[model samples]
Target: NQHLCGSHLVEALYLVCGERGFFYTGIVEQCCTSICSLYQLENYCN
Candidate 1:
């Protein structure tokens, strides 16, 4: 299996926040892990 948390992830995260800037912090945190892993070239987000 293959997956990536790159630009698309950020875009989706922002969209989920919406104009009011309201969203679950946990989602951002979740995205951050994957984003970091993608940049760092790691297999797991943690």
Candidate 2:
């Protein structure tokens, strides 16, 4: 009985996207209730 919407792998989401300019959108897992999203910055991208 130990789970946290996969939150245990926090680094999994940030470490990878950290370089690609991606970020977590404050969402959770899908198993129960969540909105696991990863948005990218494109303010002035070409």
Candidate 3:
């Protein structure tokens, strides 16, 4: 088992939203958590 809510998540998030003008609202962990939740449905939106 492994935790998916860490730098891996953060890095992916950054790559996806890096040019979308989105700003981090919390710690890297919190941001990753929020993003993982947002993507649970796995909607591939750009």
Off by over 4 Å in 2: 1-6, 20-26, 29-46
**Clashes (N, CA, C under 3 Å) per candidate:** 0, 0, 0
Put down candidate 1 lDDT per residue, 1-46, tens digits, no spaces: 1132446654543433445543233433554444433343222222
TM-score of 3: 0.29
Q: Is candidate 1 or candidate 2 better by lDDT?
A: 1
Clashing pairs in 3: none
Candidate 1 error regions (>4 Å): 1-4, 22-29, 32-46
Candidate-wise lDDT, in order: 0.39, 0.35, 0.45
User: Considering every candidate listed, which one attains the maximal TM-score?
Assistant: 3
Q: Model 1, 35: alpha-carbon shift in Å?
A: 11
**Consecutive 10-residue window with the lowest summed lDDT within model 2:** 37-46
Residue 40 lDDT in model 3?
A: 38
Residue-wise C-alpha lDDT for candidate 2, range 1-46, written one tens digit per residue: 2232565435344543445554334234342254333332121110
Model 3 segments beyond 4 Å from truth? 1-3, 24-46
TM-score on alpha carbons, each prediction? 0.27, 0.25, 0.29
lDDT winner between candidates 2 and 3: 3
Candidate 2 vs candidate 3: the TM-score winner is 3
